[PDB]
């Protein structure tokens, strides 16, 4: 009844990005904390499935953290914040997403 952490919205501007439901524990966790070449840390939720986003150039497979997938930016679709990345060419699942768990918003349906 009334479930208030049901969907994840875009934290900047309140765009639909994915549901809780969708949550994926990728290597038995849905977190996995992570750094970038640059040093900057992110703690990632991974999710089977998110819409409302904009994936940006072409695959990479360069410093992926999850082995055998390749890599492309999520915007926000709407305002254009980095929400995370889109994982493909992998298996078991060949997809996935890998959402920044700070810059989304939990809340009702
Ligand atoms: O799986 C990933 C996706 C984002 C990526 N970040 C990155 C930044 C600059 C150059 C190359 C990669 C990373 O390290 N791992
Ligand atoms: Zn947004």
């Known amino acids: 009844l009334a479930p208030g952490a049901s969907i994840f919205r875009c934290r900047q501007c309140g765009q639909?990005?994915?549901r809780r439901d969708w949550l994926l524990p990728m290597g038995g966790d849905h977190?996995?904390?992570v750094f970038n070449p640059a040093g900057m840390?992110?703690?990632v939720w991974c999710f089977s499935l998110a819409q409302?986003?904009?994936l940006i150039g072409a695959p990479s497979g360069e410093f992926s953290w999850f082995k055998g997938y390749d890599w492309?930016?999520?915007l926000?679709?709407?305002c254009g914040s980095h929400l995370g990345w889109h994982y493909e060419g992998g298996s078991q699942?060949?997809?996935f997403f890998g959402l920044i768990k700070?810059?989304?918003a939990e809340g009702p349906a």
């Open 76 to 78: 926000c679709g709407q």
């Open 41 to 43: 840390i992110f703690r």
């Open 52 to 54: 409302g986003l904009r």
């Open 72 to 74: 492309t930016i999520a």
């Open 16 to 18: 639909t990005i994915s």
């Open 102 to 104: 700070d810059r989304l």
């Open 93 to 95: 699942p060949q997809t």
């Open 31 to 33: 977190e996995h904390v």
